[PDB]
Design a protein around this ligand. Sequence first.
Ligand SMILES: *[C@H](c1[nH]c(/C=C2\NC(=O)C(CC)=C2C)c(C)c1CCC(=O)O)c1[nH]c(C[C@H]2NC(=O)C(C)=C2[C@@H](*)C)c(C)c1CCC(=O)O
Ligand SMILES: *[C@H](c1[nH]c(/C=C2\NC(=O)C(CC)=C2C)c(C)c1CCC(=O)O)c1[nH]c(C[C@H]2NC(=O)C(C)=C2[C@@H](*)C)c(C)c1CCC(=O)O
Ligand SMILES: [Mg+2]
Ligand SMILES: [Mg+2]
Ligand SMILES: [Mg+2]
Ligand SMILES: [Mg+2]
Lengths: 150, 150
Amino acid sequence: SELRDRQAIFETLVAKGRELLACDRVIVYAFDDNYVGTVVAESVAEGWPQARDQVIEDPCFREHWVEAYRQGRIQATTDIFKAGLTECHLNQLRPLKVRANLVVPMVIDDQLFGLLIAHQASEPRQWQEIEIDQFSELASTGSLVLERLH
Amino acid sequence: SELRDRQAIFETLVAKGRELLACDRVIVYAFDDNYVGTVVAESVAEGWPQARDQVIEDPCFREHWVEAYRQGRIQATTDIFKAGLTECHLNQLRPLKVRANLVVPMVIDDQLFGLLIAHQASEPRQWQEIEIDQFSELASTGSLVLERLH
Ligand SMILES: *[C@H](c1[nH]c(/C=C2\NC(=O)C(CC)=C2C)c(C)c1CCC(=O)O)c1[nH]c(C[C@H]2NC(=O)C(C)=C2[C@@H](*)C)c(C)c1CCC(=O)O
Ligand SMILES: *[C@H](c1[nH]c(/C=C2\NC(=O)C(CC)=C2C)c(C)c1CCC(=O)O)c1[nH]c(C[C@H]2NC(=O)C(C)=C2[C@@H](*)C)c(C)c1CCC(=O)O
Ligand SMILES: [Mg+2]
Ligand SMILES: [Mg+2]
Ligand SMILES: [Mg+2]
Ligand SMILES: [Mg+2]
């Protein structure tokens, strides 16, 4: 089925993503029609909390970032505690132990289906250009495959 | 249908592969149980013969290299005319036009499904570490997608 196909691609991307970056967690954060996000796929190293299946109602995508991510925005943050983020935002990440994150979009037929997100837990991390490129290309490959499958 | 889904992934791999490398041709070369290979997808620049839909039986794989390719072996050849190859080997490449090539494995369910292959047709080409890494990861990503899709 279409949804099973999407899930197979998502599970592939999180597994290869974590292997590529050797980070602590990679997820696909998939959007519903209102851009409420569900963690539909996760690859996480041993010992860290499992975000899989969590529903996170974060309004900043619907309200602020849908267009930029459709246009290919990438956001990389070395230390989430030194990024001017509000407590409301931090409280979404604290239970998952996020200290640094890297966000690339999954754009399928010009629509934002979700985000592929890497986490470094309890440890700041300066994401390097080549890591960002490889992570972005992974998301692009998965998105293009889904475009062609249906 | 596995066959239709297969082609969708292969078309993404060859198109993205040739864009990444800016080379003359990228193909998927898939093995059967005799380890005879068939070119099942191709992206090729203008002016070069279309290698698509060629069955090419090369015994060196089954006789020497299948297990090595399963374990991540590649072939990076800067100039095929300086590799001391036999007339049999040159003969099978002559209709396609191959001056340099990069061969990376596609491993699915711990079996060698085939090879993702890049050709430069009219000049030597020293393949760079970043290119080999990107091309290998493209093949690995596509292989894992197929592994999880069905
Ligand atoms: C925008 C925003 N949210 C997220 C969310 C996540 N990062 C992750 O790693 C995960 C998985 C655990 C999620 C989910 C990101 C990365 C961003 C930044 C987008 C970008 O800059 O490209 C955002 N959301 C909030 C929440 C806050 N604002 C509210 O109105 C309410 C209510 C909130 C609490 C839930 C904030 C502060 C931001 C950043 C500020 C902004 O860009 O508007
Ligand atoms: C091994 C060998 N064959 C190939 C084949 C290809 N290169 C390409 O670009 C394509 C797509 C058009 C194909 C197909 C490669 C890359 C390699 C090297 C493998 C490796 O070392 O990793 C090989 N095959 C032959 C052919 C020759 N030997 C025979 O017994 C008969 C019959 C032949 C004619 C068909 C040769 C000489 C080699 C190299 C020597 C070896 O590895 O055994
Ligand atoms: Mg189907
Ligand atoms: Mg690597
Ligand atoms: Mg489509
Ligand atoms: Mg399978």
